């Protein structure tokens, strides 16, 4: 059972800008998604400070980067707090409407796309490199769900019957044909060292057969 939703108009406009604007510095998508993972890990860690049982769904707090050249996907996995179904529908737990408003004023007032994270909508920088994004998520207070969008004004949400995740979020980037450099080990390592050197969780870059 798949539910299809329309993006709010401001979010659709944000994704069309990210997709259509000529902007060569696409690598910041990875910094933005890792920083989102770090924020989600901070949240479950804080909650566990007063309720250890919050970590019954997984004690390890980490970030994995999994490239797959056969599928042409880059997956960013974290064991953070995750998202409820309501969170997924409400712009993946962001205040995306007011965030978009600010970001697009900043853009007309000098800023560039790389600053998207300062407006709380860094998730959508995934569409710099991905034609389709799938988000699998599990929050302690809800079931496992899969969100998906190829932009175009709509997204879907369904119960995920795939591999149980325990707790956290998995962002699966179905990369554009000309963006496969972000599956190469040496290019991912470069980006992580350049932009994510101070993330306080272990970031493991998986290698391929
Ligand atoms: O708004 C613009 N681009 C834009 C905005 C948000 C984005 F996430 C993005 F990738 C590109 C134009 C350059 C200023 C006018």
PDB file of C-alpha atoms and ligand atoms in Angstrom:
ATOM      1  CA  UNK A   1       0.000   0.000   0.000  1.00  0.00           C
ATOM      2  CA  UNK A   2       1.694   3.148  -1.315  1.00  0.00           C
ATOM      3  CA  UNK A   3       0.571   6.662  -0.402  1.00  0.00           C
ATOM      4  CA  UNK A   4       1.413   9.430  -2.879  1.00  0.00           C
ATOM      5  CA  UNK A   5       1.686  13.012  -1.618  1.00  0.00           C
ATOM      6  CA  UNK A   6       2.232  16.383  -3.279  1.00  0.00           C
ATOM      7  CA  UNK A   7       5.160  18.456  -2.072  1.00  0.00           C
ATOM      8  CA  UNK A   8       4.172  21.807  -0.678  1.00  0.00           C
ATOM      9  CA  UNK A   9       4.684  24.371  -3.417  1.00  0.00           C
ATOM     10  CA  UNK A  10       7.689  26.006  -1.751  1.00  0.00           C
ATOM     11  CA  UNK A  11       9.484  22.649  -1.417  1.00  0.00           C
ATOM     12  CA  UNK A  12       8.766  21.740  -5.035  1.00  0.00           C
ATOM     13  CA  UNK A  13      10.220  25.113  -6.005  1.00  0.00           C
ATOM     14  CA  UNK A  14      13.292  24.406  -3.860  1.00  0.00           C
ATOM     15  CA  UNK A  15      13.893  21.056  -5.521  1.00  0.00           C
ATOM     16  CA  UNK A  16      13.422  22.469  -9.020  1.00  0.00           C
ATOM     17  CA  UNK A  17      15.998  25.174  -8.252  1.00  0.00           C
ATOM     18  CA  UNK A  18      18.467  22.583  -6.949  1.00  0.00           C
ATOM     19  CA  UNK A  19      17.939  20.469 -10.067  1.00  0.00           C
ATOM     20  CA  UNK A  20      17.955  23.193 -12.719  1.00  0.00           C
ATOM     21  CA  UNK A  21      20.449  25.793 -11.472  1.00  0.00           C
ATOM     22  CA  UNK A  22      23.894  25.486 -12.993  1.00  0.00           C
ATOM     23  CA  UNK A  23      26.125  24.946  -9.947  1.00  0.00           C
ATOM     24  CA  UNK A  24      29.348  22.972 -10.268  1.00  0.00           C
ATOM     25  CA  UNK A  25      30.130  22.425  -6.548  1.00  0.00           C
ATOM     26  CA  UNK A  26      27.815  19.422  -6.236  1.00  0.00           C
ATOM     27  CA  UNK A  27      30.004  17.556  -3.726  1.00  0.00           C
ATOM     28  CA  UNK A  28      28.493  19.465  -0.779  1.00  0.00           C
ATOM     29  CA  UNK A  29      25.511  17.071  -0.878  1.00  0.00           C
ATOM     30  CA  UNK A  30      27.604  14.594   1.093  1.00  0.00           C
ATOM     31  CA  UNK A  31      28.613  17.123   3.748  1.00  0.00           C
ATOM     32  CA  UNK A  32      24.943  18.030   4.150  1.00  0.00           C
ATOM     33  CA  UNK A  33      23.712  14.451   4.519  1.00  0.00           C
ATOM     34  CA  UNK A  34      26.476  13.530   6.952  1.00  0.00           C
ATOM     35  CA  UNK A  35      25.671  16.605   9.021  1.00  0.00           C
ATOM     36  CA  UNK A  36      22.007  15.526   9.036  1.00  0.00           C
ATOM     37  CA  UNK A  37      23.113  12.091  10.253  1.00  0.00           C
ATOM     38  CA  UNK A  38      25.265  13.695  12.958  1.00  0.00           C
ATOM     39  CA  UNK A  39      22.287  15.791  14.112  1.00  0.00           C
ATOM     40  CA  UNK A  40      20.077  12.677  14.298  1.00  0.00           C
ATOM     41  CA  UNK A  41      22.746  10.822  16.261  1.00  0.00           C
ATOM     42  CA  UNK A  42      23.061  13.762  18.677  1.00  0.00           C
ATOM     43  CA  UNK A  43      19.303  13.497  19.262  1.00  0.00           C
ATOM     44  CA  UNK A  44      19.192   9.820  20.200  1.00  0.00           C
ATOM     45  CA  UNK A  45      22.342  10.236  22.293  1.00  0.00           C
ATOM     46  CA  UNK A  46      20.748  13.080  24.258  1.00  0.00           C
ATOM     47  CA  UNK A  47      17.600  11.019  24.874  1.00  0.00           C
ATOM     48  CA  UNK A  48      19.670   8.053  26.031  1.00  0.00           C
ATOM     49  CA  UNK A  49      21.306  10.267  28.672  1.00  0.00           C
ATOM     50  CA  UNK A  50      18.179  10.046  30.836  1.00  0.00           C
ATOM     51  CA  UNK A  51      16.647   6.816  29.452  1.00  0.00           C
ATOM     52  CA  UNK A  52      19.178   4.103  28.550  1.00  0.00           C
ATOM     53  CA  UNK A  53      16.400   1.914  27.110  1.00  0.00           C
ATOM     54  CA  UNK A  54      16.263   4.337  24.169  1.00  0.00           C
ATOM     55  CA  UNK A  55      19.325   2.456  22.883  1.00  0.00           C
ATOM     56  CA  UNK A  56      17.683  -0.969  23.137  1.00  0.00           C
ATOM     57  CA  UNK A  57      17.201  -0.709  19.364  1.00  0.00           C
ATOM     58  CA  UNK A  58      20.965  -0.325  18.862  1.00  0.00           C
ATOM     59  CA  UNK A  59      23.806   0.874  21.076  1.00  0.00           C
ATOM     60  CA  UNK A  60      26.232   1.791  18.271  1.00  0.00           C
ATOM     61  CA  UNK A  61      26.083   5.404  17.045  1.00  0.00           C
ATOM     62  CA  UNK A  62      27.747   5.608  13.643  1.00  0.00           C
ATOM     63  CA  UNK A  63      27.580   6.626   9.987  1.00  0.00           C
ATOM     64  CA  UNK A  64      28.280   4.272   7.078  1.00  0.00           C
ATOM     65  CA  UNK A  65      28.797   5.251   3.445  1.00  0.00           C
ATOM     66  CA  UNK A  66      28.001   2.427   1.045  1.00  0.00           C
ATOM     67  CA  UNK A  67      28.695   2.894  -2.663  1.00  0.00           C
ATOM     68  CA  UNK A  68      27.327   0.328  -5.097  1.00  0.00           C
ATOM     69  CA  UNK A  69      28.440   0.694  -8.715  1.00  0.00           C
ATOM     70  CA  UNK A  70      26.181  -2.090 -10.024  1.00  0.00           C
ATOM     71  CA  UNK A  71      23.057  -0.380  -8.662  1.00  0.00           C
ATOM     72  CA  UNK A  72      24.589   3.096  -9.150  1.00  0.00           C
ATOM     73  CA  UNK A  73      23.628   4.038  -5.597  1.00  0.00           C
ATOM     74  CA  UNK A  74      25.371   5.775  -2.740  1.00  0.00           C
ATOM     75  CA  UNK A  75      23.749   4.956   0.602  1.00  0.00           C
ATOM     76  CA  UNK A  76      24.327   7.017   3.757  1.00  0.00           C
ATOM     77  CA  UNK A  77      23.304   5.026   6.844  1.00  0.00           C
ATOM     78  CA  UNK A  78      23.145   6.365  10.376  1.00  0.00           C
ATOM     79  CA  UNK A  79      21.880   4.881  13.636  1.00  0.00           C
ATOM     80  CA  UNK A  80      20.422   8.185  14.795  1.00  0.00           C
ATOM     81  CA  UNK A  81      16.980   8.864  16.239  1.00  0.00           C
ATOM     82  CA  UNK A  82      15.257   8.170  12.921  1.00  0.00           C
ATOM     83  CA  UNK A  83      11.918   9.522  11.765  1.00  0.00           C
ATOM     84  CA  UNK A  84       8.275   8.684  12.356  1.00  0.00           C
ATOM     85  CA  UNK A  85       5.829   8.455   9.459  1.00  0.00           C
ATOM     86  CA  UNK A  86       4.533  11.901  10.424  1.00  0.00           C
ATOM     87  CA  UNK A  87       8.119  13.207  10.324  1.00  0.00           C
ATOM     88  CA  UNK A  88       8.670  11.792   6.826  1.00  0.00           C
ATOM     89  CA  UNK A  89       5.507  13.399   5.508  1.00  0.00           C
ATOM     90  CA  UNK A  90       6.318  16.716   7.197  1.00  0.00           C
ATOM     91  CA  UNK A  91       9.364  17.283   4.967  1.00  0.00           C
ATOM     92  CA  UNK A  92      11.606  14.670   6.626  1.00  0.00           C
ATOM     93  CA  UNK A  93      11.470  16.360  10.005  1.00  0.00           C
ATOM     94  CA  UNK A  94      12.474  19.815   8.749  1.00  0.00           C
ATOM     95  CA  UNK A  95      10.810  23.201   8.829  1.00  0.00           C
ATOM     96  CA  UNK A  96      11.275  23.225   5.094  1.00  0.00           C
ATOM     97  CA  UNK A  97       8.699  25.912   4.268  1.00  0.00           C
ATOM     98  CA  UNK A  98      10.321  28.673   6.321  1.00  0.00           C
ATOM     99  CA  UNK A  99      13.768  27.281   5.533  1.00  0.00           C
ATOM    100  CA  UNK A 100      13.156  27.523   1.787  1.00  0.00           C
ATOM    101  CA  UNK A 101      11.840  31.071   2.149  1.00  0.00           C
ATOM    102  CA  UNK A 102      15.061  32.173   3.868  1.00  0.00           C
ATOM    103  CA  UNK A 103      17.423  30.232   1.609  1.00  0.00           C
ATOM    104  CA  UNK A 104      15.951  31.655  -1.584  1.00  0.00           C
ATOM    105  CA  UNK A 105      16.194  35.214  -0.263  1.00  0.00           C
ATOM    106  CA  UNK A 106      19.818  34.564   0.670  1.00  0.00           C
ATOM    107  CA  UNK A 107      20.418  33.290  -2.871  1.00  0.00           C
ATOM    108  CA  UNK A 108      19.132  36.511  -4.419  1.00  0.00           C
ATOM    109  CA  UNK A 109      21.190  38.426  -1.809  1.00  0.00           C
ATOM    110  CA  UNK A 110      24.590  36.920  -2.700  1.00  0.00           C
ATOM    111  CA  UNK A 111      24.601  33.412  -1.231  1.00  0.00           C
ATOM    112  CA  UNK A 112      25.125  30.182  -3.170  1.00  0.00           C
ATOM    113  CA  UNK A 113      23.695  26.678  -2.984  1.00  0.00           C
ATOM    114  CA  UNK A 114      26.542  25.378  -0.809  1.00  0.00           C
ATOM    115  CA  UNK A 115      25.040  27.384   2.076  1.00  0.00           C
ATOM    116  CA  UNK A 116      21.783  25.375   1.984  1.00  0.00           C
ATOM    117  CA  UNK A 117      22.578  23.709   5.314  1.00  0.00           C
ATOM    118  CA  UNK A 118      22.401  27.016   7.179  1.00  0.00           C
ATOM    119  CA  UNK A 119      18.679  27.045   6.327  1.00  0.00           C
ATOM    120  CA  UNK A 120      17.802  23.584   7.640  1.00  0.00           C
ATOM    121  CA  UNK A 121      16.938  22.035   4.267  1.00  0.00           C
ATOM    122  CA  UNK A 122      20.292  20.447   3.433  1.00  0.00           C
ATOM    123  CA  UNK A 123      18.609  17.102   2.778  1.00  0.00           C
ATOM    124  CA  UNK A 124      17.353  18.376  -0.570  1.00  0.00           C
ATOM    125  CA  UNK A 125      20.917  18.936  -1.823  1.00  0.00           C
ATOM    126  CA  UNK A 126      20.768  15.203  -2.528  1.00  0.00           C
ATOM    127  CA  UNK A 127      19.096  16.156  -5.814  1.00  0.00           C
ATOM    128  CA  UNK A 128      22.335  17.780  -6.949  1.00  0.00           C
ATOM    129  CA  UNK A 129      23.573  14.262  -7.763  1.00  0.00           C
ATOM    130  CA  UNK A 130      20.564  11.935  -7.499  1.00  0.00           C
ATOM    131  CA  UNK A 131      17.695  11.468  -9.920  1.00  0.00           C
ATOM    132  CA  UNK A 132      15.796   9.569  -7.222  1.00  0.00           C
ATOM    133  CA  UNK A 133      16.208   9.465  -3.448  1.00  0.00           C
ATOM    134  CA  UNK A 134      14.875   6.706  -1.180  1.00  0.00           C
ATOM    135  CA  UNK A 135      14.802   7.260   2.599  1.00  0.00           C
ATOM    136  CA  UNK A 136      14.342   4.230   4.854  1.00  0.00           C
ATOM    137  CA  UNK A 137      13.809   5.120   8.481  1.00  0.00           C
ATOM    138  CA  UNK A 138      12.959   3.598  11.849  1.00  0.00           C
ATOM    139  CA  UNK A 139      12.166   5.636  14.954  1.00  0.00           C
ATOM    140  CA  UNK A 140      11.711   4.004  18.370  1.00  0.00           C
ATOM    141  CA  UNK A 141       8.096   5.227  18.431  1.00  0.00           C
ATOM    142  CA  UNK A 142       6.998   4.034  14.970  1.00  0.00           C
ATOM    143  CA  UNK A 143       7.359   1.313  12.334  1.00  0.00           C
ATOM    144  CA  UNK A 144       9.910   1.140   9.520  1.00  0.00           C
ATOM    145  CA  UNK A 145       8.892   3.294   6.553  1.00  0.00           C
ATOM    146  CA  UNK A 146      10.277   4.070   3.091  1.00  0.00           C
ATOM    147  CA  UNK A 147       9.964   7.570   1.590  1.00  0.00           C
ATOM    148  CA  UNK A 148      10.797   8.047  -2.075  1.00  0.00           C
ATOM    149  CA  UNK A 149      10.854  10.861  -4.626  1.00  0.00           C
ATOM    150  CA  UNK A 150      12.160  11.502  -8.125  1.00  0.00           C
ATOM    151  CA  UNK A 151      11.095  15.151  -7.627  1.00  0.00           C
ATOM    152  CA  UNK A 152       8.407  16.108 -10.136  1.00  0.00           C
ATOM    153  CA  UNK A 153       6.182  17.436  -7.372  1.00  0.00           C
ATOM    154  CA  UNK A 154       5.329  14.255  -5.469  1.00  0.00           C
ATOM    155  CA  UNK A 155       6.739  11.715  -3.047  1.00  0.00           C
ATOM    156  CA  UNK A 156       5.552   8.335  -1.820  1.00  0.00           C
ATOM    157  CA  UNK A 157       5.501   6.744   1.608  1.00  0.00           C
ATOM    158  CA  UNK A 158       5.014   3.045   2.283  1.00  0.00           C
ATOM    159  CA  UNK A 159       5.684   0.555   5.020  1.00  0.00           C
ATOM    160  CA  UNK A 160       9.124  -0.924   4.423  1.00  0.00           C
ATOM    161  CA  UNK A 161       9.238  -4.723   4.211  1.00  0.00           C
ATOM    162  CA  UNK A 162      12.984  -4.715   3.521  1.00  0.00           C
ATOM    163  CA  UNK A 163      15.807  -5.509   5.922  1.00  0.00           C
ATOM    164  CA  UNK A 164      14.843  -4.398   9.463  1.00  0.00           C
ATOM    165  CA  UNK A 165      17.037  -1.467  10.485  1.00  0.00           C
ATOM    166  CA  UNK A 166      16.676  -1.380  14.263  1.00  0.00           C
ATOM    167  CA  UNK A 167      16.823   2.420  14.498  1.00  0.00           C
ATOM    168  CA  UNK A 168      18.084   5.203  12.290  1.00  0.00           C
ATOM    169  CA  UNK A 169      17.921   6.450   8.739  1.00  0.00           C
ATOM    170  CA  UNK A 170      19.197   5.229   5.395  1.00  0.00           C
ATOM    171  CA  UNK A 171      19.408   7.711   2.503  1.00  0.00           C
ATOM    172  CA  UNK A 172      19.759   5.862  -0.800  1.00  0.00           C
ATOM    173  CA  UNK A 173      20.954   8.142  -3.606  1.00  0.00           C
ATOM    174  CA  UNK A 174      20.117   6.801  -7.071  1.00  0.00           C
ATOM    175  CA  UNK A 175      22.831   8.772  -8.823  1.00  0.00           C
ATOM    176  CA  UNK A 176      22.514  10.620 -12.113  1.00  0.00           C
ATOM    177  CA  UNK A 177      24.414   9.006 -14.980  1.00  0.00           C
ATOM    178  CA  UNK A 178      27.093  11.727 -15.053  1.00  0.00           C
ATOM    179  CA  UNK A 179      27.536  11.779 -11.256  1.00  0.00           C
ATOM    180  CA  UNK A 180      29.146   8.363 -10.770  1.00  0.00           C
ATOM    181  CA  UNK A 181      32.372   9.908  -9.452  1.00  0.00           C
ATOM    182  CA  UNK A 182      30.661   9.890  -6.041  1.00  0.00           C
ATOM    183  CA  UNK A 183      30.838   6.084  -6.077  1.00  0.00           C
ATOM    184  CA  UNK A 184      34.640   6.098  -6.304  1.00  0.00           C
ATOM    185  CA  UNK A 185      36.467   5.418  -3.057  1.00  0.00           C
ATOM    186  CA  UNK A 186      39.136   8.060  -3.521  1.00  0.00           C
ATOM    187  CA  UNK A 187      36.587  10.773  -4.375  1.00  0.00           C
ATOM    188  CA  UNK A 188      34.373   9.981  -1.364  1.00  0.00           C
ATOM    189  CA  UNK A 189      37.412   9.968   0.954  1.00  0.00           C
ATOM    190  CA  UNK A 190      38.443  13.363  -0.400  1.00  0.00           C
ATOM    191  CA  UNK A 191      35.004  14.862   0.275  1.00  0.00           C
ATOM    192  CA  UNK A 192      34.760  13.430   3.786  1.00  0.00           C
ATOM    193  CA  UNK A 193      38.199  14.718   4.738  1.00  0.00           C
ATOM    194  CA  UNK A 194      37.486  18.135   3.196  1.00  0.00           C
ATOM    195  CA  UNK A 195      34.051  18.775   4.692  1.00  0.00           C
ATOM    196  CA  UNK A 196      33.367  16.340   7.540  1.00  0.00           C
ATOM    197  CA  UNK A 197      36.651  16.177   9.446  1.00  0.00           C
ATOM    198  CA  UNK A 198      34.996  17.271  12.702  1.00  0.00           C
ATOM    199  CA  UNK A 199      31.933  14.995  12.742  1.00  0.00           C
ATOM    200  CA  UNK A 200      31.943  13.301  16.142  1.00  0.00           C
ATOM    201  CA  UNK A 201      30.844   9.844  15.001  1.00  0.00           C
ATOM    202  CA  UNK A 202      32.773   7.145  13.128  1.00  0.00           C
ATOM    203  CA  UNK A 203      32.249   7.387   9.369  1.00  0.00           C
ATOM    204  CA  UNK A 204      33.012   4.099   7.656  1.00  0.00           C
ATOM    205  CA  UNK A 205      33.443   4.083   3.889  1.00  0.00           C
ATOM    206  CA  UNK A 206      32.552   0.582   2.691  1.00  0.00           C
ATOM    207  CA  UNK A 207      34.543  -0.849  -0.202  1.00  0.00           C
ATOM    208  CA  UNK A 208      33.260  -2.968  -3.067  1.00  0.00           C
ATOM    209  CA  UNK A 209      34.133  -6.411  -4.423  1.00  0.00           C
TER     210      UNK A 209
HETATM  211  O1  LIG B   1      18.020  30.414  -6.179  1.00  0.00           O
HETATM  212  C1  LIG B   1      18.881  30.068  -6.976  1.00  0.00           C
HETATM  213  N1  LIG B   1      19.489  28.860  -6.962  1.00  0.00           N
HETATM  214  C2  LIG B   1      19.404  27.801  -6.026  1.00  0.00           C
HETATM  215  C3  LIG B   1      18.685  27.924  -4.846  1.00  0.00           C
HETATM  216  C4  LIG B   1      18.640  26.881  -3.934  1.00  0.00           C
HETATM  217  C5  LIG B   1      19.326  25.726  -4.208  1.00  0.00           C
HETATM  218  F1  LIG B   1      19.305  24.694  -3.340  1.00  0.00           F
HETATM  219  C6  LIG B   1      20.048  25.603  -5.363  1.00  0.00           C
HETATM  220  F2  LIG B   1      20.710  24.450  -5.597  1.00  0.00           F
HETATM  221  C7  LIG B   1      20.104  26.626  -6.283  1.00  0.00           C
HETATM  222  C8  LIG B   1      19.431  31.007  -8.016  1.00  0.00           C
HETATM  223  C9  LIG B   1      20.890  31.424  -7.742  1.00  0.00           C
HETATM  224  C10 LIG B   1      20.311  32.525  -6.850  1.00  0.00           C
HETATM  225  C11 LIG B   1      19.089  32.491  -7.771  1.00  0.00           C
END
